[PDB]
Amino acid sequence: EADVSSDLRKEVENHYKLSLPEDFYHFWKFCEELDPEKPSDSLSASLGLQLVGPYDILAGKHKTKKKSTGLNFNLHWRFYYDPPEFQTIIIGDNKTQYHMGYFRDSPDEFPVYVGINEAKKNCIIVPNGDNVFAAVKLFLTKKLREITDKKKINLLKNIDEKLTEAARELGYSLEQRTVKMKQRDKKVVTKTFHGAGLVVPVDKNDVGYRELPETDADLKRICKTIVEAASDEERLKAFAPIQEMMTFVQFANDECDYGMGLELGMDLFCYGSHYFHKVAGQLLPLAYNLLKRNLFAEIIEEHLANRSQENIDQLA
């Protein structure tokens, strides 16, 4: 529907090995209307936002860089707490590492919504509309509730008018939670530490998921002790509840409740300590492969082997 060629779509989607929803392409064409020379930067002066990630490929920024020479889009603008489900498309304030990304429960599916995270604050992912028009509209509306500078306010209200009309013509909801998101949230089996929810198939016999034997609050206490341990011996002791839960994940896998191991590995990734990288590097690849979500197994293994806090632009 958007006026982007088949060839340019395949360039974006074959590099990421993910399809992009149509609002991705429509929004690019909107930003070109905003600034034909540099559409990626059309929101920078007004909102402090820049389009990146798959938008870098639409922009032609990847030209003269190849896979052979070290180009890995699985890590491109992948911030420290971005799980495989989360694909960055927009960056904001560098002080908080604010950014937005498409959230996919499965590589075989279109994104459920646009989530945001401030990677210098925490691992929390917040839903922010189901398409990028909504996500930027909601951000803009919030900025308008925070400022009184009349010049900036008039700039934002113009962009708001343009964005709102474009989304209405295309049929994109500007609500923070849409029907699509509400239906997906009824299939969430656990929030996980990042709060954005985990979705795995659960059949008529309730096969597919089972809970962890610790509350989230108590698992965080366990992780804290592992981090604060003062020697190898102390740390092995503090790891005992984790090893126990990893054993129970094995039983759950044998009975096709693959979501339990996905949840444990995700929470350990979300906690952030490098002390969890080897255990999450066992739990998550196996869970994703058992769930036929192979691309996410590939992402998590590459990201844990190179989990950078500040040099994540593959095109710099």
Binding site: V207, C256, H274, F276
Partner: protein, 234 residues
């Protein structure tokens, strides 16, 4: 203590002097000769039935013991008449084996209050709860008189078996190749490598076997296993 050294080390691991603790087990324990046929069979069973999704460790056989619990053969005798008798794995935490050997396997895990067995060594090995710094476990081989199996593809809490049935089999997607089954002292040993079971809509990766009468079990071997973990813990 005139007990062989491997037996003495087993006693130390499970728990007075050694020969007095040995008596508490009410079990005859002998070392299987590394060059015997029993040892060949048992090591092949271990080698062939490590599942592909249990990839955190490899298993190394340290010692194999032949065990006979006091009174158990007599207790099992009426069930020896039943068809479908199979040699199966059962793992448990090391701290349970004192009671397991003295009292036998007991009844209080998703098919109710029963005694559980697997035909994949690594499935049972996981119930040892061994750890990176605690890498030695114990696993049993038991003769199980399964008879008429109640075959299931997902969890059911069984108060009682359906009339005519003697045990429950959870159907795995993967099964030891039945063409490789062998017979050992009147027991079927399913020691072939795993192939597809052809079971179409089951929610278990590997078989489970459950019996609901403690007399349906005759423990035959006890193995001491080294868990060689493939990566460090952190």
């Amino acid at each position: 203590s005139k007990l062989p050294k491997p037996v003495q080390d087993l006693i130390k691991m499970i728990f007075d002097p050694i020969d007095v603790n040995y008596e508490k087990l009410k079990t005859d324990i002998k070392v299987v000769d590394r060059d015997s046929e029993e040892a060949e069979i048992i090591r092949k069973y271990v080698k062939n039935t490590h599942a592909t999704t249990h990839n955190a460790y490899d298993l190394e056989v340290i010692d194999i013991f032949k065990i006979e619990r006091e009174g158990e053969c007599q207790r099992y005798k009426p069930f020896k008449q039943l068809h479908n008798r199979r040699l199966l794995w059962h793992g448990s935490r090391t701290t349970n084996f004192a009671g397991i050997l003295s009292q036998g396997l007991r009844i209080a895990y998703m098919f109710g209050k029963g005694i559980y067995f697997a035909d994949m060594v690594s499935k049972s090995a996981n119930y040892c709860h061994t750890s990176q710094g605690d890498p030695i476990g114990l696993i049993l081989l038991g003769e199980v008189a399964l008879g008429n199996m109640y075959e299931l593809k997902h969890a059911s809490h069984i108060s009682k078996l359906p009339k005519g049935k003697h045990s429950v089999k959870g159907l795995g997607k993967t099964t030891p190749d039945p063409s490789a089954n062998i017979s050992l002292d009147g027991v079927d040993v399913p020691l072939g490598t795993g192939i597809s079971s052809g079971v179409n809509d089951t929610s278990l990766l590997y078989n489970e076997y459950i019996v609901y009468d403690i007399a349906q079990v005759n423990l035959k071997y006890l193995l001491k296993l080294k868990f060689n973990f493939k990566t460090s813990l952190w």
